[model samples]
Target: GKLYTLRYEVEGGGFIEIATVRPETVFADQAIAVHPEDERYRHLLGKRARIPLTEVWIPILADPAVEKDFGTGALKVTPAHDPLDYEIGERHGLKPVSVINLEGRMEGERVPEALRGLDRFEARRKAVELFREAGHLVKEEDY
Candidate 1:
C-alpha cells in the first residue's frame, strides 16, 4: 500500500496533517474524522477542514469509530472508498462524492483538469505532486 501524508488547511489559517494511502480519494473526502476521546482533536469536533485544491469544506466530527492512534488520529472520510466511512457519512448526513469514474479515471468536476481522465494510480501520483507543489504535502512513508 502507498502512504501519503498531506496537510489540510483549517478555516482560520492553520493546517492539520493527515496520512492516507489513497491520495486520489482526497477529492471525495466528505469529512475529517477523529476519535471523540482523542484529547488532541477534542476541541476541533465541530470545526471544518478544507479539502486541498478544492473549494469544498467538510466538517470535523468526533466518532467512536476512529482509531485514536491511527495515522494522525485524524481520518479523511471518503465514503465512496471505505465501508466504515460510508456508514459514518450516513450517520452524519454527509453526501457521498464520487471522484472515480467507471473507467478508473477521475470523474468529478471538483477534480483538477490535469488529474481528470488519468488512471487511479497516475492520479494518486499527480495528486501527491500537486500537494507537494502547493506546500500541502507533509511527508510520505512506506509500510
Candidate 2:
C-alpha cells in the first residue's frame, strides 16, 4: 500500500496536514497545534481545530511544546502518549484514547477491522522501515 495522508482541521477553521504512522489515534485527538511563531499558523491562535480523518474536533493552540524544527513545525495532539498533549486535550474538551486488550494495541474485537490484528509496535516499525526503504524518510533522528 502507498503512503497515506492524515488531514486535520484546525479549530480556528483550517486543515493542517500531517504524516502519521498511527492513524488509530485520530479519534482520540484533542487539538491540532503549531509553534507559537509559526508564520503559517499565526492566525490560528486560540481557535478550535477539527480532525479530518475522524469526527474529533480540537482547538488550535500555541504551545512552547512544539518543536519548530520538527516535521512541518506542527504537532498532532495525542493525549495518551504525550503528557503535554494530554493536558491540552483536557483543557479543551478532547477525549482520551483508551487502551484496551493488552500491550496497548487495540484489540481486534474492539478495534476497527482496518486497524485490528496489527501490533502497534510492529505497525510502527514496518511503516518506518517501508518509508526508509522507499527513500521517503526525509530525516532521521532521535526525539
Candidate 3:
C-alpha cells in the first residue's frame, strides 16, 4: 500500500502530519487521532485543523486506540470506511460522510469538484496529486 503524509497547517503556525494510505477517502475524514501520551501531538489536543485538500476543519483527538509508533503517530479518522476508525469516531462524536458509491467511484458533493465521480483508482491518482498541489502532502511511499 502507499503511505502518504497528509499535513494540515495550523492557523497560528506549525502543522499536524497524518499518515494515510487511502487518498480516496480524503473527503471522508472526520478527525485526526493521536495517542494521549504521544508528546509529538500533545499540544494539538482540543485544537482544530483543516482536513488535507479540503476546507473542513476537524478536531484533533487523543485516544488510546491510536498506535503511537505507527506512521507518524497520527491517524485520519474516516469512520464508515474502516472498522477501527468507525469505533474511534463513535468515541469522538464524529459523523461519517460517504463519498464512494456502490459502484466503487467517488461521488457526492462532499468531494472536491476535481475529484468527484471518478473511479477509485483514477480518483486516488488525482487525489494524491491534488493533495500535493494543495500543499497538504508531505511525502508518499510504499508501506
Candidate 4:
C-alpha cells in the first residue's frame, strides 16, 4: 500500500513529514509545544505554528511538566488528551476529532487512504520508519 503523508515545516526549517497515528487530531490541535527548560527548543515557547495534516495554526507554549526527551522535544496538543488541553480547546473554541478506532486501528472516513484500515501500531511502525528514512526522527524510545 502507498504511504500516507503529512508534509510540514517547523517555524523556520523546510518541510518535514512526521509519522503519527493520531492524524485526526491534527485539526483540533491548539499548540505545538515543548518544555520551557529543554534548551533545545526553549526559543519556541509562546510561538505559533500550523499543523500540516489539518491546516490548523496553533501556539507553542511551555509546560514544565513536559519531558524534553520524549517522542519529540515538541508535543502537539489536542484537547482530547485530558485536563489542560481539553479546557484550552474549549476556551479557544477548537473542535475535536477522534482518530483511533475501537480496535486500535486508524478508522473514520477522515483518515487518508493509505493510513485507513491499518492497525494503530502498524501505522506507527510504518510512520517511524518513513521518518527515519527521511532523517526527521530525533530519536525513538519504549516505555
| Leading candidate by TM-score | 1
Best by lDDT: 1
Query: For model 2, how does the per-residue alpha-carbon lDDT over 26-139 read when each residue is reduced to its tens digit?
Result: 445566767788898778777766654234456677777777776566677878766877877776666666533357665433244445456775545554555445344444
15, model 3: CA deviation in Å? Answer: 1.1
- The regions of model 4 sitting more than 4 angstroms off are 1-8, 14-30, 50-57, 68-73, 81-95, 108-112, 141-143
5-53, model 4: which lDDT tens digit per residue? 4444566655433333454445445666566787766766665675654
Per-residue lDDT over 35-100 for candidate 3, one digit per residue giving the tens place of the 0 to 100 score: 999999898898987866666888888999899999899888889799999999888888888889
Q: Across residues 1-143, which tens digit of lDDT does each residue of candidate 1 receive?
A: 66788888887778887899999889999999998988888887788899999988889998898997889989999888889899999988888889998889898888977899999989998988998998988888887
Runs of candidate 3 with Cα error greater than 4 angstroms are: none
Candidate 1, clashing residue pairs?
Answer: none
Give the range of the ten consecutive residues with the poorest summed lDDT in model 2. Answer: 134-143
The lDDT values for all models are 0.88, 0.59, 0.86, 0.56
- Candidate 1's displacement at residue 21, Å, is 0.4
Residue 68, model 2, lDDT: 70
Worst 10 residues of 3 by lDDT: 49-58
Ranking by TM-score: 1, 3, 2, 4
